[PDB]
Amino acid sequence: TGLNGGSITEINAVTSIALVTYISWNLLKNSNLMPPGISSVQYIIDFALNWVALLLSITIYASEPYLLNTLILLPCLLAFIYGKFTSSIYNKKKMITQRFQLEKKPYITAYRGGMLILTAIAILAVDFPIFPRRFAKVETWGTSLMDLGVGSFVFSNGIVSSRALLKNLSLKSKPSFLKNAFNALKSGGTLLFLGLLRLFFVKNLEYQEHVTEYGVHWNFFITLSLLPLVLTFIDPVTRMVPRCSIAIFISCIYEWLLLKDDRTLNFLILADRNCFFSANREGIFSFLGYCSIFLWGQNTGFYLLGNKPTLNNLYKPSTQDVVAASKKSSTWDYWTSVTPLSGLCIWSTIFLVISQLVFQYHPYSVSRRFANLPYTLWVITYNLLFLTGYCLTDKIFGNSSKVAECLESINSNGLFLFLLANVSTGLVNMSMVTIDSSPLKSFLVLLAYCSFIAVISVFLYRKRIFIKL
Ligand SMILES: CCCCCCCCCCCCCCCC(=O)SCCNC(=O)CCNC(=O)[C@H](O)C(C)(C)COP(=O)(O)OP(=O)(O)OC[C@H]1O[C@@H](n2cnc3c(N)ncnc32)[C@H](O)[C@@H]1OP(=O)(O)O
């Protein structure tokens, strides 16, 4: 680390392989040349498309992603054409009779699985000399590949956590104010406990400082735990204003406070670590950006988790039908009641136009350490623009009415496999010296580790075992 990072135009090219391989898998599956029953060929193809391709893209072919993105796509298209040439239900009454329910979407499963796979690879890949130094994290100002996961995980959690509000809306009795706090504590208990355990153990660890990231005591597992508890209190205010109008206000207030004078920056950068507040400045101050990211994720998760469009679902959680509203509908309810793709396109366009003008006037640059406005804009725009393609692929190929096994397996056992991967890298880091390894040895070690994780994950999934911590 310690070097200025790369650019966005390289990060996009490096990370597009996750969507390219998904499209290739869909094409190959629809080519109909594969045998119907499960076999070794299916597992080999799945493992080569999911795990190995990302490993090659991150490490060896990092200097030529455009050449890698075609050798996977073209043969599958040729096979699809060959199969198509060689080869010899939706009802409106159902939609009328259907009520409002939650549904499990496949592209969300793929989007969650790919991020976990990439995180699991890149956690260990950073300790070897074959991993380019441009992708390592940067201190204060700068952009890199490893500064995006921290925002992406918060965005994904915000997207998912809206189904609780959608479900509780159908309830005929309002839960008490003290009951939601208990629910939030129950949801965040394991993360809070694992975060607190590190404070009691750092003294025994006596590892490197790394204080400048979050502080002496603060941690990411506390930031993830405290968000729902704080956002519980916000609902009475949202009774009067839309949810996004709170994120906008918070972002504007924080940016005005940062750009008003240089005193705040001087305190944040040069102040001595004397008292508790001075020893955890960054962890406390990045909360005002993480809250905005979480709120925007929650707002985005309103029109994706349903099974049919409802009334005013672009900005409000609602279950009212639009069939009765279709009689002499106004010009507002016609535009603010959309299918998932229509909402995603509108929000992507608005955020692109806002960011393209914000980036031309901000004197400073992106900074994860403080989580200022440009970082949030970049994090949100990237995720919206990837979800748009992920959703469009399903509509083009027509499967909205399962996905590769290695994606579902890693999606169904997230936290446990994350901890297992962390322990594995911790073991390899002490079983050998990494910085003095030859490239072939490094590649073999990475391949063996990937195979071990994949085998364990699939074995847990087949036998129907789900571990909740
Ligand atoms: C493509 C890549 C793009 C981004 C590309 C950018 C770069 C990407 C990083 C790369 C650069 C290296 C890496 C940097 C970053 C670090 O180096 S480190 C980052 C730090 N990471 C962490 O701390 C891990 C955080 N983990 C968590 O927040 C969570 O525990 C997990 C593991 C993500 C998910 O946990 P969980 O929510 O308990 O999971 P789970 O119970 O399975 O699901 C929860 C809910 O979702 C529901 N659900 C699940 N699937 C679905 C579905 N398909 N539909 C609907 N609902 C669903 C479940 O039914 C459940 O519903 P409820 O029961 O809540 O009602």
Side-chain angles (χ1 to χ4, degrees), residues 1-91 94-96 98-205 208-325 330-469:
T1 72
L3 288 181
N4 47 84
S7 56
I8 313 174
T9 55
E10 175 183 28
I11 297 162
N12 307 347
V14 167
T15 316
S16 299
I17 188 60
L19 175 56
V20 164
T21 188
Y22 178 75
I23 293 168
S24 81
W25 155 269
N26 266 351
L27 275 168
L28 185 166
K29 196 64 173 173
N30 284 10
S31 79
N32 208 43
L33 259 79
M34 288 217 57
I38 67 169
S39 284
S40 53
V41 179
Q42 175 81 100
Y43 282 125
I44 285 164
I45 288 170
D46 178 23
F47 181 81
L49 276 170
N50 280 308
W51 283 87
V52 177
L54 278 157
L55 180 65
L56 283 177
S57 211
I58 285 297
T59 284
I60 287 293
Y61 287 87
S63 48
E64 49 212 1
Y66 285 81
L67 183 142
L68 179 55
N69 274 283
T70 70
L71 278 35
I72 278 305
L73 198 58
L74 185 67
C76 289
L77 192 140
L78 292 185
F80 171 77
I81 271 292
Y82 186 26
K84 174 79 47 152
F85 275 57
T86 293
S87 186
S88 64
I89 187 59
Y90 319 104
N91 288 298
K94 174 167 55 181
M95 172 219 98
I96 292 294
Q98 273 204 130
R99 266 63 183 183
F100 191 77
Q101 296 161 330
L102 301 170
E103 283 205 346
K104 189 166 182 174
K105 302 285 203 289
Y107 56 88
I108 299 182
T109 294
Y111 167 79
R112 298 179 111 254
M115 184 163 22
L116 277 156
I117 288 174
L118 194 52
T119 291
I121 287 169
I123 277 288
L124 178 60
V126 83
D127 286 333
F128 288 77
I130 72 187
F131 180 84
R133 296 295 103 180
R134 303 195 310 281
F135 297 152
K137 60 103 161 185
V138 68
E139 183 172 73
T140 69
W141 326 102
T143 57
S144 73
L145 186 86
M146 286 208 192
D147 295 286
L148 204 51
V150 185
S152 298
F153 275 96
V154 179
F155 195 80
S156 297
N157 288 18
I159 284 181
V160 162
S161 149
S162 166
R163 72 213 313 272
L165 318 182
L166 284 174
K167 183 190 296 282
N168 264 316
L169 194 54
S170 176
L171 196 59
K172 66 191 187 78
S173 58
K174 285 183 178 178
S176 70
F177 191 88
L178 305 175
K179 165 43 191 313
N180 281 337
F182 224 93
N183 293 347
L185 198 32
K186 171 66 174 183
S187 81
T190 181
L191 276 190
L192 176 33
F193 194 70
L194 275 188
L196 284 176
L197 190 61
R198 265 163 79 52
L199 328 175
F200 205 80
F201 212 71
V202 281
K203 286 195 175 187
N204 187 59
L205 291 172
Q208 267 292 337
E209 304 280 5
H210 300 347
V211 46
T212 52
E213 280 192 26
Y214 293 102
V216 180
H217 297 137
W218 213 278
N219 198 2
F220 187 55
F221 282 177
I222 301 179
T223 295
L224 256 186
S225 273
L226 290 183
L227 282 160
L229 268 77
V230 179
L231 289 191
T232 278
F233 303 169
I234 284 297
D235 293 326
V237 157
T238 75
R239 204 51 51 61
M240 291 166 93
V241 294
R243 208 165 212 91
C244 62
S245 298
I246 299 180
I248 289 166
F249 204 78
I250 289 174
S251 304
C252 295
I253 285 295
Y254 186 31
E255 204 60 31
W256 166 80
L257 183 139
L258 272 177
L259 276 170
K260 171 187 64 179
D261 198 9
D262 196 41
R263 171 253 165 180
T264 310
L265 280 163
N266 290 328
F267 164 64
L268 221 58
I269 271 174
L270 313 147
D272 315 318
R273 300 208 184 264
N274 154 287
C275 71
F276 171 76
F277 177 60
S278 147
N280 304 293
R281 324 175 298 263
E282 302 95 313
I284 289 174
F285 264 96
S286 63
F287 215 77
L288 303 186
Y290 287 122
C291 277
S292 171
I293 297 168
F294 199 86
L295 285 176
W296 272 110
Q298 262 193 349
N299 183 76
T300 278
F302 279 148
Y303 43 84
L304 294 179
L305 296 185
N307 78 321
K308 74 186 184 74
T310 54
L311 188 83
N312 278 280
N313 62 353
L314 192 68
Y315 61 86
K316 192 207 303 184
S318 183
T319 61
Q320 288 198 337
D321 40 286
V322 291
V323 281
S330 82
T331 189
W332 175 262
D333 300 296
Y334 176 75
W335 290 114
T336 61
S337 313
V338 289
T339 37
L341 200 57
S342 316
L344 274 168
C345 295
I346 294 174
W347 280 129
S348 303
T349 281
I350 288 168
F351 265 93
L352 260 177
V353 176
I354 288 291
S355 88
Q356 212 84 359
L357 305 180
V358 152
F359 269 90
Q360 290 222 320
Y361 280 79
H362 205 282
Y364 304 146
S365 325
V366 187
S367 173
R368 153 150 82 72
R369 199 187 182 198
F370 310 140
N372 47 325
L373 184 142
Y375 178 65
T376 71
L377 287 187
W378 173 43
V379 163
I380 293 162
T381 306
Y382 182 82
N383 278 283
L384 282 174
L385 284 183
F386 253 55
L387 265 167
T388 303
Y390 259 111
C391 178
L392 179 54
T393 295
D394 276 1
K395 169 157 287 293
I396 284 297
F397 274 95
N399 64 357
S400 291
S401 65
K402 304 176 75 65
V403 295
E405 191 92 331
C406 287
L407 256 48
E408 297 206 348
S409 163
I410 191 64
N411 171 55
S412 303
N413 274 303
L415 192 60
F416 174 76
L417 291 165
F418 177 82
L419 300 173
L420 175 65
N422 272 11
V423 171
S424 306
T425 88
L427 174 128
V428 201
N429 270 345
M430 290 209 75
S431 183
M432 85 159 322
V433 284
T434 64
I435 202 45
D436 292 338
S437 64
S438 314
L440 186 64
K441 193 175 183 177
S442 304
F443 199 86
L444 289 168
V445 167
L446 286 181
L447 188 58
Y449 160 84
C450 292
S451 294
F452 167 75
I453 293 297
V455 161
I456 288 298
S457 79
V458 170
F459 180 78
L460 272 173
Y461 172 78
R462 284 300 303 278
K463 302 292 110 174
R464 191 151 310 294
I465 301 177
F466 305 127
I467 304 175
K468 302 295 179 65
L469 294 92

